[PDB]
Design goal:
Chain lengths: 149, 149, 149, 149
Protein backbone atom coordinates (compact mmCIF):
# COMPACT_ATOMS: atom_id res chain seq x y z
CA UNK A 1 0.00 0.00 0.00
CA UNK A 2 2.91 2.36 0.67
CA UNK A 3 5.04 3.34 -2.30
CA UNK A 4 7.91 5.80 -2.40
CA UNK A 5 8.20 8.97 -4.40
CA UNK A 6 11.75 9.31 -5.78
CA UNK A 7 13.37 12.45 -7.15
CA UNK A 8 16.74 12.30 -8.88
CA UNK A 9 17.09 8.87 -7.37
CA UNK A 10 16.21 10.21 -3.88
CA UNK A 11 13.19 9.40 -1.69
CA UNK A 12 11.22 12.61 -1.11
CA UNK A 13 7.95 11.37 0.38
CA UNK A 14 5.50 8.53 -0.04
CA UNK A 15 2.40 7.49 -1.91
CA UNK A 16 -0.39 5.47 -0.47
CA UNK A 17 -3.16 3.23 -1.79
CA UNK A 18 -6.16 4.30 0.35
CA UNK A 19 -9.75 3.38 -0.49
CA UNK A 20 -9.88 3.16 -4.25
CA UNK A 21 -7.59 6.11 -5.01
CA UNK A 22 -3.77 6.37 -5.01
CA UNK A 23 -2.61 9.26 -2.84
CA UNK A 24 0.60 11.28 -2.50
CA UNK A 25 1.10 14.78 -1.12
CA UNK A 26 1.06 17.42 -3.85
CA UNK A 27 4.12 19.17 -2.44
CA UNK A 28 6.28 16.02 -2.84
CA UNK A 29 8.70 16.22 -5.80
CA UNK A 30 9.42 13.11 -7.82
CA UNK A 31 7.46 10.28 -9.35
CA UNK A 32 6.15 7.15 -7.67
CA UNK A 33 8.76 4.42 -7.88
CA UNK A 34 6.37 1.93 -9.45
CA UNK A 35 5.68 1.56 -13.16
CA UNK A 36 1.95 0.95 -12.84
CA UNK A 37 1.53 3.87 -10.45
CA UNK A 38 3.88 6.32 -12.19
CA UNK A 39 2.03 6.30 -15.52
CA UNK A 40 -1.28 7.32 -13.95
CA UNK A 41 -3.08 10.65 -14.34
CA UNK A 42 -3.30 12.49 -11.02
CA UNK A 43 -5.78 15.26 -10.12
CA UNK A 44 -4.10 17.93 -8.04
CA UNK A 45 -5.99 19.76 -5.22
CA UNK A 46 -4.02 22.67 -3.71
CA UNK A 47 -6.51 23.23 -0.89
CA UNK A 48 -5.80 19.76 0.48
CA UNK A 49 -2.21 19.69 -0.74
CA UNK A 50 -3.40 16.29 -1.97
CA UNK A 51 -2.92 14.68 -5.38
CA UNK A 52 -5.03 11.58 -6.00
CA UNK A 53 -5.59 9.14 -8.88
CA UNK A 54 -7.40 5.81 -9.20
CA UNK A 55 -5.92 2.41 -8.29
CA UNK A 56 -5.40 0.06 -11.27
CA UNK A 57 -7.65 -3.03 -10.97
CA UNK A 58 -4.62 -5.32 -10.45
CA UNK A 59 -3.55 -3.40 -7.32
CA UNK A 60 -6.99 -2.60 -5.85
CA UNK A 61 -6.60 -5.66 -3.62
CA UNK A 62 -3.56 -3.83 -2.24
CA UNK A 63 -5.34 -0.73 -0.99
CA UNK A 64 -5.82 0.08 2.68
CA UNK A 65 -9.28 1.10 3.96
CA UNK A 66 -8.71 4.40 6.52
CA UNK A 67 -12.10 5.26 8.99
CA UNK A 68 -13.52 8.39 10.55
CA UNK A 69 -13.48 6.58 13.88
CA UNK A 70 -10.67 7.86 15.99
CA UNK A 71 -11.11 7.93 19.78
CA UNK A 72 -8.55 9.64 21.96
CA UNK A 73 -5.68 7.24 22.56
CA UNK A 74 -2.62 5.89 20.77
CA UNK A 75 -2.28 5.19 17.07
CA UNK A 76 0.39 3.39 15.06
CA UNK A 77 2.81 4.79 12.49
CA UNK A 78 6.17 3.69 11.09
CA UNK A 79 8.23 5.50 13.60
CA UNK A 80 6.31 4.47 16.63
CA UNK A 81 3.08 5.41 18.30
CA UNK A 82 1.19 8.57 17.55
CA UNK A 83 -1.06 10.08 20.24
CA UNK A 84 -4.51 11.44 19.52
CA UNK A 85 -6.34 13.82 21.83
CA UNK A 86 -8.03 17.21 21.71
CA UNK A 87 -8.52 16.68 18.02
CA UNK A 88 -4.78 16.60 17.46
CA UNK A 89 -2.23 13.92 16.56
CA UNK A 90 1.20 14.37 18.13
CA UNK A 91 4.53 12.59 18.48
CA UNK A 92 7.80 12.97 20.36
CA UNK A 93 9.63 15.78 18.61
CA UNK A 94 12.36 14.36 16.45
CA UNK A 95 10.53 11.18 15.49
CA UNK A 96 9.19 12.65 12.25
CA UNK A 97 11.33 14.39 9.64
CA UNK A 98 11.07 15.82 6.13
CA UNK A 99 10.42 12.93 3.80
CA UNK A 100 7.79 11.27 6.00
CA UNK A 101 4.79 12.82 4.18
CA UNK A 102 2.40 10.28 2.75
CA UNK A 103 2.98 7.84 5.61
CA UNK A 104 -0.35 6.61 7.06
CA UNK A 105 -1.29 6.55 10.72
CA UNK A 106 -3.00 3.22 11.33
CA UNK A 107 -5.04 2.17 14.28
CA UNK A 108 -4.79 -1.25 15.92
CA UNK A 109 -7.05 -2.95 13.39
CA UNK A 110 -5.12 -1.63 10.42
CA UNK A 111 -7.58 1.02 9.35
CA UNK A 112 -5.70 4.08 8.05
CA UNK A 113 -6.85 6.97 10.27
CA UNK A 114 -4.94 9.95 8.77
CA UNK A 115 -2.06 10.64 6.37
CA UNK A 116 0.88 12.80 7.53
CA UNK A 117 1.66 15.96 5.56
CA UNK A 118 4.01 17.73 7.95
CA UNK A 119 4.31 18.80 11.55
CA UNK A 120 4.52 21.89 13.72
CA UNK A 121 7.12 21.81 16.48
CA UNK A 122 5.67 22.90 19.77
CA UNK A 123 8.44 21.74 22.11
CA UNK A 124 8.50 18.31 23.67
CA UNK A 125 5.96 17.15 21.09
CA UNK A 126 5.08 17.99 17.49
CA UNK A 127 1.42 18.40 16.43
CA UNK A 128 1.04 16.63 13.12
CA UNK A 129 -0.56 18.21 10.08
CA UNK A 130 -2.70 15.42 8.60
CA UNK A 131 -5.33 14.53 6.00
CA UNK A 132 -8.23 12.86 7.89
CA UNK A 133 -11.66 11.55 7.10
CA UNK A 134 -14.71 13.27 8.49
CA UNK A 135 -18.25 11.81 8.57
CA UNK A 136 -17.57 10.62 5.06
CA UNK A 137 -15.47 13.34 3.48
CA UNK A 138 -11.75 14.04 3.53
CA UNK A 139 -10.36 16.89 5.64
CA UNK A 140 -7.03 18.45 6.51
CA UNK A 141 -5.85 19.45 9.95
CA UNK A 142 -2.85 21.77 10.01
CA UNK A 143 -1.53 22.92 13.41
CA UNK A 144 -0.30 26.50 13.65
CA UNK A 145 3.29 26.77 12.37
CA UNK A 146 3.50 23.42 10.59
CA UNK A 147 6.66 22.51 8.67
CA UNK A 148 5.61 20.57 5.60
CA UNK A 149 7.57 17.32 5.55
CA UNK B 1 -32.89 -24.26 -3.93
CA UNK B 2 -29.97 -24.19 -6.38
CA UNK B 3 -30.66 -25.46 -9.89
CA UNK B 4 -28.33 -25.47 -12.86
CA UNK B 5 -28.75 -23.72 -16.17
CA UNK B 6 -27.57 -26.01 -18.99
CA UNK B 7 -26.75 -25.00 -22.55
CA UNK B 8 -26.08 -27.61 -25.21
CA UNK B 9 -25.72 -30.05 -22.37
CA UNK B 10 -23.24 -27.75 -20.57
CA UNK B 11 -23.62 -25.96 -17.21
CA UNK B 12 -23.44 -22.21 -17.81
CA UNK B 13 -24.62 -20.74 -14.51
CA UNK B 14 -27.21 -21.40 -11.84
CA UNK B 15 -30.75 -20.62 -10.84
CA UNK B 16 -31.91 -20.04 -7.33
CA UNK B 17 -35.18 -20.25 -5.43
CA UNK B 18 -35.05 -17.09 -3.25
CA UNK B 19 -38.09 -15.69 -1.44
CA UNK B 20 -41.05 -16.59 -3.58
CA UNK B 21 -39.41 -16.01 -6.97
CA UNK B 22 -37.07 -18.22 -9.03
CA UNK B 23 -33.93 -16.33 -10.00
CA UNK B 24 -31.18 -16.78 -12.60
CA UNK B 25 -28.85 -14.20 -14.11
CA UNK B 26 -30.17 -12.80 -17.38
CA UNK B 27 -26.79 -13.13 -19.08
CA UNK B 28 -26.70 -16.92 -18.50
CA UNK B 29 -27.44 -18.95 -21.66
CA UNK B 30 -29.41 -22.16 -21.41
CA UNK B 31 -32.54 -23.35 -19.68
CA UNK B 32 -32.95 -24.49 -16.09
CA UNK B 33 -32.33 -28.22 -15.87
CA UNK B 34 -35.64 -28.90 -14.15
CA UNK B 35 -38.95 -29.55 -15.90
CA UNK B 36 -41.10 -27.57 -13.47
CA UNK B 37 -38.72 -24.62 -13.54
CA UNK B 38 -37.93 -24.65 -17.27
CA UNK B 39 -41.54 -24.23 -18.42
CA UNK B 40 -42.03 -21.04 -16.41
CA UNK B 41 -42.45 -17.50 -17.77
CA UNK B 42 -39.56 -15.27 -16.70
CA UNK B 43 -39.57 -11.45 -16.58
CA UNK B 44 -36.24 -10.07 -17.73
CA UNK B 45 -34.73 -6.91 -16.15
CA UNK B 46 -31.58 -5.65 -17.94
CA UNK B 47 -30.79 -3.06 -15.28
CA UNK B 48 -30.32 -5.79 -12.68
CA UNK B 49 -29.13 -8.37 -15.18
CA UNK B 50 -31.73 -10.41 -13.31
CA UNK B 51 -34.47 -12.66 -14.70
CA UNK B 52 -37.07 -13.77 -12.17
CA UNK B 53 -40.27 -15.85 -12.21
CA UNK B 54 -42.54 -17.26 -9.50
CA UNK B 55 -41.94 -20.53 -7.62
CA UNK B 56 -44.54 -23.25 -8.31
CA UNK B 57 -46.55 -24.06 -5.14
CA UNK B 58 -45.01 -27.57 -4.94
CA UNK B 59 -41.47 -26.14 -4.68
CA UNK B 60 -42.18 -23.05 -2.54
CA UNK B 61 -41.15 -25.09 0.51
CA UNK B 62 -37.78 -25.35 -1.25
CA UNK B 63 -37.02 -21.64 -1.45
CA UNK B 64 -34.31 -19.94 0.58
CA UNK B 65 -35.12 -16.72 2.48
CA UNK B 66 -31.91 -14.06 1.80
CA UNK B 67 -31.83 -10.74 4.50
CA UNK B 68 -30.61 -7.18 4.29
CA UNK B 69 -28.60 -7.83 7.44
CA UNK B 70 -24.97 -8.19 6.58
CA UNK B 71 -22.37 -7.04 9.13
CA UNK B 72 -18.72 -6.91 8.18
CA UNK B 73 -17.24 -10.38 8.57
CA UNK B 74 -17.16 -13.71 6.76
CA UNK B 75 -19.93 -15.25 4.71
CA UNK B 76 -20.37 -18.71 3.21
CA UNK B 77 -20.46 -19.76 -0.44
CA UNK B 78 -19.83 -23.00 -2.32
CA UNK B 79 -16.20 -22.41 -2.86
CA UNK B 80 -15.36 -21.30 0.60
CA UNK B 81 -15.76 -18.20 2.68
CA UNK B 82 -16.54 -14.82 1.24
CA UNK B 83 -15.43 -11.69 3.12
CA UNK B 84 -17.64 -8.66 3.57
CA UNK B 85 -16.31 -5.23 4.48
CA UNK B 86 -16.43 -1.67 3.19
CA UNK B 87 -19.65 -2.55 1.46
CA UNK B 88 -17.87 -5.09 -0.69
CA UNK B 89 -17.79 -8.90 -0.91
CA UNK B 90 -14.44 -10.39 -1.91
CA UNK B 91 -12.70 -13.74 -2.27
CA UNK B 92 -9.24 -15.12 -2.95
CA UNK B 93 -8.66 -14.55 -6.65
CA UNK B 94 -9.07 -17.81 -8.49
CA UNK B 95 -11.79 -19.23 -6.26
CA UNK B 96 -14.60 -17.99 -8.50
CA UNK B 97 -14.79 -18.61 -12.24
CA UNK B 98 -17.17 -18.15 -15.17
CA UNK B 99 -20.13 -20.40 -14.55
CA UNK B 100 -20.52 -19.49 -10.87
CA UNK B 101 -23.23 -16.84 -11.45
CA UNK B 102 -26.45 -17.53 -9.61
CA UNK B 103 -24.66 -19.09 -6.66
CA UNK B 104 -25.90 -17.58 -3.35
CA UNK B 105 -23.73 -16.24 -0.57
CA UNK B 106 -25.23 -17.51 2.68
CA UNK B 107 -24.54 -16.36 6.16
CA UNK B 108 -24.13 -18.71 9.12
CA UNK B 109 -27.87 -19.09 9.69
CA UNK B 110 -28.57 -19.97 6.09
CA UNK B 111 -30.08 -16.69 5.04
CA UNK B 112 -29.07 -15.87 1.45
CA UNK B 113 -27.25 -12.52 1.67
CA UNK B 114 -26.39 -11.83 -2.03
CA UNK B 115 -26.28 -13.66 -5.36
CA UNK B 116 -23.04 -13.66 -7.40
CA UNK B 117 -23.16 -12.23 -10.92
CA UNK B 118 -19.46 -11.87 -11.68
CA UNK B 119 -16.27 -10.49 -10.24
CA UNK B 120 -13.63 -7.85 -10.85
CA UNK B 121 -10.03 -8.95 -10.37
CA UNK B 122 -8.12 -6.51 -8.25
CA UNK B 123 -5.04 -8.61 -7.47
CA UNK B 124 -4.81 -10.86 -4.46
CA UNK B 125 -8.60 -10.68 -4.11
CA UNK B 126 -11.58 -10.28 -6.42
CA UNK B 127 -14.44 -7.89 -5.51
CA UNK B 128 -17.66 -9.70 -6.31
CA UNK B 129 -20.44 -8.17 -8.36
CA UNK B 130 -23.62 -9.21 -6.55
CA UNK B 131 -27.40 -8.77 -6.32
CA UNK B 132 -28.18 -7.78 -2.70
CA UNK B 133 -31.19 -6.76 -0.69
CA UNK B 134 -31.47 -3.25 0.66
CA UNK B 135 -33.93 -2.08 3.35
CA UNK B 136 -36.51 -4.16 1.54
CA UNK B 137 -35.66 -3.81 -2.13
CA UNK B 138 -33.21 -5.63 -4.37
CA UNK B 139 -29.98 -3.92 -5.47
CA UNK B 140 -26.91 -4.68 -7.52
CA UNK B 141 -23.33 -3.93 -6.57
CA UNK B 142 -20.84 -4.09 -9.43
CA UNK B 143 -17.18 -3.33 -8.65
CA UNK B 144 -15.23 -1.39 -11.28
CA UNK B 145 -13.99 -3.73 -14.02
CA UNK B 146 -16.16 -6.75 -13.21
CA UNK B 147 -15.98 -9.84 -15.43
CA UNK B 148 -19.46 -11.28 -15.65
CA UNK B 149 -19.26 -14.95 -14.69
CA UNK C 1 31.39 2.32 -7.24
CA UNK C 2 31.85 -0.12 -10.13
CA UNK C 3 29.04 -0.31 -12.66
CA UNK C 4 28.91 -2.32 -15.86
CA UNK C 5 28.59 -1.06 -19.39
CA UNK C 6 26.24 -3.36 -21.35
CA UNK C 7 25.87 -3.56 -25.12
CA UNK C 8 23.10 -5.60 -26.70
CA UNK C 9 22.67 -7.19 -23.32
CA UNK C 10 26.42 -7.96 -23.10
CA UNK C 11 29.02 -6.60 -20.65
CA UNK C 12 31.67 -4.71 -22.62
CA UNK C 13 33.61 -2.86 -19.93
CA UNK C 14 32.97 -1.00 -16.69
CA UNK C 15 32.21 2.41 -15.29
CA UNK C 16 33.57 3.76 -12.09
CA UNK C 17 32.60 6.41 -9.56
CA UNK C 18 35.97 8.08 -8.80
CA UNK C 19 36.29 11.42 -7.00
CA UNK C 20 33.20 13.36 -7.94
CA UNK C 21 32.99 12.25 -11.58
CA UNK C 22 31.62 9.04 -13.14
CA UNK C 23 34.19 7.43 -15.41
CA UNK C 24 34.11 4.84 -18.20
CA UNK C 25 36.56 4.27 -21.04
CA UNK C 26 35.53 6.09 -24.21
CA UNK C 27 36.25 3.04 -26.39
CA UNK C 28 33.70 0.91 -24.47
CA UNK C 29 30.45 0.35 -26.41
CA UNK C 30 27.16 0.24 -24.55
CA UNK C 31 25.44 2.24 -21.85
CA UNK C 32 25.94 2.02 -18.10
CA UNK C 33 23.55 -0.54 -16.66
CA UNK C 34 22.12 1.89 -14.12
CA UNK C 35 19.22 4.27 -14.72
CA UNK C 36 20.67 7.20 -12.79
CA UNK C 37 24.05 6.82 -14.47
CA UNK C 38 22.81 6.08 -17.99
CA UNK C 39 20.82 9.31 -18.38
CA UNK C 40 23.83 11.51 -17.65
CA UNK C 41 25.69 13.77 -20.09
CA UNK C 42 29.27 12.59 -20.59
CA UNK C 43 32.18 14.70 -21.90
CA UNK C 44 34.39 12.65 -24.19
CA UNK C 45 38.20 13.15 -24.27
CA UNK C 46 39.95 11.18 -27.05
CA UNK C 47 43.43 11.99 -25.80
CA UNK C 48 42.75 10.15 -22.54
CA UNK C 49 40.33 7.68 -24.11
CA UNK C 50 38.30 8.78 -21.08
CA UNK C 51 34.65 9.81 -20.90
CA UNK C 52 33.60 11.42 -17.61
CA UNK C 53 30.42 12.96 -16.17
CA UNK C 54 29.40 14.13 -12.70
CA UNK C 55 28.06 11.87 -9.92
CA UNK C 56 24.41 12.54 -8.96
CA UNK C 57 24.17 13.83 -5.36
CA UNK C 58 22.40 10.62 -4.22
CA UNK C 59 25.36 8.46 -5.30
CA UNK C 60 28.25 10.78 -4.36
CA UNK C 61 28.54 8.86 -1.09
CA UNK C 62 29.28 5.87 -3.33
CA UNK C 63 32.36 7.26 -5.05
CA UNK C 64 35.87 5.97 -4.45
CA UNK C 65 38.70 8.44 -3.75
CA UNK C 66 42.00 7.21 -6.07
CA UNK C 67 45.70 9.01 -4.88
CA UNK C 68 48.89 9.94 -6.66
CA UNK C 69 50.77 7.96 -4.03
CA UNK C 70 51.95 4.71 -5.47
CA UNK C 71 55.22 3.21 -4.19
CA UNK C 72 56.74 0.21 -5.90
CA UNK C 73 55.04 -2.92 -4.59
CA UNK C 74 51.80 -4.85 -5.02
CA UNK C 75 48.37 -3.41 -5.68
CA UNK C 76 44.92 -4.96 -5.64
CA UNK C 77 42.51 -5.53 -8.53
CA UNK C 78 39.58 -7.87 -9.16
CA UNK C 79 41.60 -10.59 -10.68
CA UNK C 80 44.35 -10.62 -8.16
CA UNK C 81 47.37 -8.55 -7.34
CA UNK C 82 48.90 -6.07 -9.72
CA UNK C 83 52.61 -5.25 -9.43
CA UNK C 84 53.97 -1.74 -9.66
CA UNK C 85 57.61 -0.95 -10.41
CA UNK C 86 59.66 1.09 -12.85
CA UNK C 87 56.63 3.26 -13.37
CA UNK C 88 54.69 0.34 -14.77
CA UNK C 89 51.78 -1.82 -13.57
CA UNK C 90 51.91 -5.45 -14.66
CA UNK C 91 50.12 -8.75 -14.14
CA UNK C 92 50.53 -12.42 -15.01
CA UNK C 93 49.64 -12.66 -18.68
CA UNK C 94 46.20 -14.13 -19.05
CA UNK C 95 44.73 -12.60 -15.91
CA UNK C 96 43.29 -9.61 -17.75
CA UNK C 97 41.11 -9.87 -20.86
CA UNK C 98 39.00 -7.67 -23.14
CA UNK C 99 36.10 -6.42 -21.09
CA UNK C 100 38.17 -5.53 -18.02
CA UNK C 101 38.55 -1.82 -18.92
CA UNK C 102 37.21 0.53 -16.29
CA UNK C 103 38.22 -1.77 -13.45
CA UNK C 104 40.15 0.16 -10.75
CA UNK C 105 43.45 -0.88 -9.22
CA UNK C 106 43.15 -0.25 -5.49
CA UNK C 107 45.86 -0.13 -2.93
CA UNK C 108 45.59 -1.71 0.52
CA UNK C 109 43.67 1.21 2.01
CA UNK C 110 41.11 1.25 -0.75
CA UNK C 111 42.36 4.30 -2.58
CA UNK C 112 41.92 3.83 -6.35
CA UNK C 113 45.44 4.16 -7.80
CA UNK C 114 44.79 3.74 -11.57
CA UNK C 115 42.03 2.59 -13.93
CA UNK C 116 42.78 -0.16 -16.49
CA UNK C 117 42.27 0.66 -20.17
CA UNK C 118 44.06 -2.25 -21.81
CA UNK C 119 47.32 -4.13 -21.73
CA UNK C 120 50.36 -4.90 -23.85
CA UNK C 121 51.55 -8.51 -23.81
CA UNK C 122 55.25 -8.73 -23.24
CA UNK C 123 55.56 -12.44 -22.44
CA UNK C 124 55.28 -13.81 -18.94
CA UNK C 125 53.67 -10.54 -17.84
CA UNK C 126 51.48 -7.88 -19.41
CA UNK C 127 52.23 -4.16 -18.84
CA UNK C 128 48.92 -2.47 -18.18
CA UNK C 129 47.78 0.66 -19.97
CA UNK C 130 46.19 2.78 -17.23
CA UNK C 131 44.72 6.18 -16.36
CA UNK C 132 46.64 7.45 -13.28
CA UNK C 133 46.77 10.57 -11.18
CA UNK C 134 49.84 12.74 -11.20
CA UNK C 135 50.64 15.49 -8.66
CA UNK C 136 47.01 16.47 -8.94
CA UNK C 137 46.11 15.89 -12.58
CA UNK C 138 45.01 12.80 -14.47
CA UNK C 139 47.43 11.02 -16.81
CA UNK C 140 47.52 8.00 -19.06
CA UNK C 141 50.29 5.43 -19.28
CA UNK C 142 50.18 3.21 -22.36
CA UNK C 143 52.92 0.58 -22.75
CA UNK C 144 54.22 -0.03 -26.28
CA UNK C 145 51.90 -2.41 -28.16
CA UNK C 146 48.90 -2.23 -25.82
CA UNK C 147 45.71 -4.12 -26.72
CA UNK C 148 42.79 -2.00 -25.60
CA UNK C 149 40.55 -4.16 -23.43
CA UNK D 1 15.38 -21.43 -23.36
CA UNK D 2 11.91 -20.39 -22.21
CA UNK D 3 11.22 -16.68 -21.98
CA UNK D 4 7.96 -14.95 -21.14
CA UNK D 5 5.94 -12.60 -23.27
CA UNK D 6 4.57 -9.76 -21.11
CA UNK D 7 1.77 -7.38 -22.00
CA UNK D 8 1.00 -4.37 -19.82
CA UNK D 9 3.12 -6.05 -17.19
CA UNK D 10 1.17 -9.33 -17.57
CA UNK D 11 2.40 -12.73 -18.81
CA UNK D 12 0.43 -13.65 -21.94
CA UNK D 13 2.37 -16.60 -23.35
CA UNK D 14 5.95 -17.72 -23.81
CA UNK D 15 8.85 -17.59 -26.21
CA UNK D 16 11.24 -20.40 -26.83
CA UNK D 17 14.78 -20.78 -28.14
CA UNK D 18 14.47 -23.85 -30.42
CA UNK D 19 17.13 -24.83 -32.96
CA UNK D 20 18.71 -21.60 -34.06
CA UNK D 21 15.54 -19.49 -34.14
CA UNK D 22 13.62 -17.75 -31.32
CA UNK D 23 9.96 -18.74 -31.37
CA UNK D 24 6.75 -17.33 -29.88
CA UNK D 25 3.16 -17.82 -31.01
CA UNK D 26 1.99 -15.04 -33.33
CA UNK D 27 -1.32 -14.68 -31.49
CA UNK D 28 0.45 -13.82 -28.19
CA UNK D 29 0.27 -10.10 -27.31
CA UNK D 30 3.22 -8.44 -25.63
CA UNK D 31 6.96 -8.36 -26.06
CA UNK D 32 9.51 -10.88 -24.84
CA UNK D 33 10.67 -9.93 -21.36
CA UNK D 34 14.33 -9.97 -22.32
CA UNK D 35 16.28 -7.04 -23.76
CA UNK D 36 18.32 -9.08 -26.23
CA UNK D 37 15.26 -10.95 -27.45
CA UNK D 38 12.82 -8.02 -27.50
CA UNK D 39 14.86 -5.89 -29.93
CA UNK D 40 14.93 -8.60 -32.59
CA UNK D 41 13.14 -8.58 -35.95
CA UNK D 42 10.54 -11.35 -36.14
CA UNK D 43 9.05 -12.85 -39.33
CA UNK D 44 5.36 -13.56 -38.88
CA UNK D 45 3.70 -16.62 -40.51
CA UNK D 46 -0.11 -16.67 -40.13
CA UNK D 47 -0.46 -20.19 -41.53
CA UNK D 48 1.58 -21.59 -38.64
CA UNK D 49 0.47 -18.93 -36.18
CA UNK D 50 4.23 -18.85 -35.60
CA UNK D 51 6.55 -15.85 -35.37
CA UNK D 52 10.26 -16.69 -35.47
CA UNK D 53 13.55 -14.74 -35.43
CA UNK D 54 17.19 -15.74 -35.09
CA UNK D 55 19.00 -16.38 -31.78
CA UNK D 56 21.77 -13.85 -30.97
CA UNK D 57 25.20 -15.55 -30.93
CA UNK D 58 25.54 -15.00 -27.15
CA UNK D 59 22.37 -17.02 -26.44
CA UNK D 60 22.72 -19.73 -29.12
CA UNK D 61 24.27 -21.97 -26.45
CA UNK D 62 20.91 -21.57 -24.69
CA UNK D 63 18.72 -23.03 -27.41
CA UNK D 64 16.95 -26.37 -27.13
CA UNK D 65 17.20 -28.89 -29.99
CA UNK D 66 13.32 -30.43 -30.61
CA UNK D 67 13.24 -33.99 -32.98
CA UNK D 68 10.75 -35.55 -35.34
CA UNK D 69 11.03 -38.74 -33.31
CA UNK D 70 7.97 -39.17 -31.20
CA UNK D 71 6.76 -42.71 -30.44
CA UNK D 72 3.43 -43.26 -28.74
CA UNK D 73 3.91 -42.86 -25.00
CA UNK D 74 4.30 -40.11 -22.41
CA UNK D 75 6.04 -36.79 -22.87
CA UNK D 76 7.05 -34.09 -20.41
CA UNK D 77 5.73 -30.54 -20.07
CA UNK D 78 5.64 -27.96 -17.28
CA UNK D 79 2.35 -29.01 -15.92
CA UNK D 80 2.96 -32.69 -15.94
CA UNK D 81 3.03 -35.47 -18.46
CA UNK D 82 1.55 -35.19 -21.90
CA UNK D 83 0.35 -38.34 -23.68
CA UNK D 84 1.03 -39.05 -27.32
CA UNK D 85 -0.94 -41.56 -29.37
CA UNK D 86 -2.92 -41.71 -32.59
CA UNK D 87 -0.95 -38.75 -33.79
CA UNK D 88 -2.35 -36.60 -31.01
CA UNK D 89 -0.97 -35.06 -27.81
CA UNK D 90 -3.42 -34.86 -24.92
CA UNK D 91 -3.57 -33.95 -21.24
CA UNK D 92 -6.01 -34.11 -18.35
CA UNK D 93 -8.51 -31.34 -19.01
CA UNK D 94 -7.79 -28.42 -16.75
CA UNK D 95 -4.02 -28.84 -16.70
CA UNK D 96 -3.47 -26.36 -19.53
CA UNK D 97 -4.92 -22.85 -19.61
CA UNK D 98 -4.73 -19.66 -21.66
CA UNK D 99 -1.23 -18.30 -21.26
CA UNK D 100 0.52 -21.65 -21.73
CA UNK D 101 1.23 -21.15 -25.47
CA UNK D 102 4.90 -21.32 -26.35
CA UNK D 103 5.61 -23.93 -23.69
CA UNK D 104 7.59 -26.87 -25.17
CA UNK D 105 6.75 -30.54 -24.76
CA UNK D 106 10.03 -32.32 -24.06
CA UNK D 107 10.75 -35.98 -24.19
CA UNK D 108 12.85 -37.81 -21.61
CA UNK D 109 16.16 -36.82 -23.19
CA UNK D 110 15.28 -33.15 -23.31
CA UNK D 111 14.58 -32.91 -27.01
CA UNK D 112 11.70 -30.49 -27.64
CA UNK D 113 9.05 -32.55 -29.45
CA UNK D 114 6.28 -29.94 -30.07
CA UNK D 115 5.29 -26.44 -28.92
CA UNK D 116 1.79 -25.86 -27.49
CA UNK D 117 -0.44 -23.31 -29.22
CA UNK D 118 -3.80 -24.12 -27.66
CA UNK D 119 -6.10 -27.02 -26.93
CA UNK D 120 -9.50 -28.40 -27.82
CA UNK D 121 -11.58 -29.71 -24.93
CA UNK D 122 -13.00 -33.10 -25.67
CA UNK D 123 -14.12 -34.11 -22.18
CA UNK D 124 -11.89 -35.95 -19.77
CA UNK D 125 -8.88 -34.97 -21.88
CA UNK D 126 -7.90 -32.06 -24.10
CA UNK D 127 -6.22 -32.68 -27.49
CA UNK D 128 -3.42 -30.18 -27.80
CA UNK D 129 -2.92 -27.97 -30.83
CA UNK D 130 0.86 -28.01 -31.40
CA UNK D 131 3.69 -27.01 -33.74
CA UNK D 132 5.67 -30.20 -34.50
CA UNK D 133 8.57 -31.22 -36.68
CA UNK D 134 8.02 -33.56 -39.58
CA UNK D 135 10.76 -35.41 -41.50
CA UNK D 136 12.69 -32.18 -41.37
CA UNK D 137 10.08 -29.45 -41.71
CA UNK D 138 7.83 -27.75 -39.19
CA UNK D 139 4.12 -28.58 -39.06
CA UNK D 140 1.05 -27.65 -37.07
CA UNK D 141 -1.53 -30.03 -35.66
CA UNK D 142 -4.79 -28.41 -34.61
CA UNK D 143 -7.53 -30.67 -33.19
CA UNK D 144 -11.12 -29.82 -34.14
CA UNK D 145 -12.48 -27.05 -31.89
CA UNK D 146 -9.18 -25.87 -30.40
CA UNK D 147 -9.16 -22.90 -28.02
CA UNK D 148 -6.00 -20.93 -28.69
CA UNK D 149 -4.19 -20.49 -25.38
Amino acid sequence: CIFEVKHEGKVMGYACLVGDKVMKPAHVKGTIDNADLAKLAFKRSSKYDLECAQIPVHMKSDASKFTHEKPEGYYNWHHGAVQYSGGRFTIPTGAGKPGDSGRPIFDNKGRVVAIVLGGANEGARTALSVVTWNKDIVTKITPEGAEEW
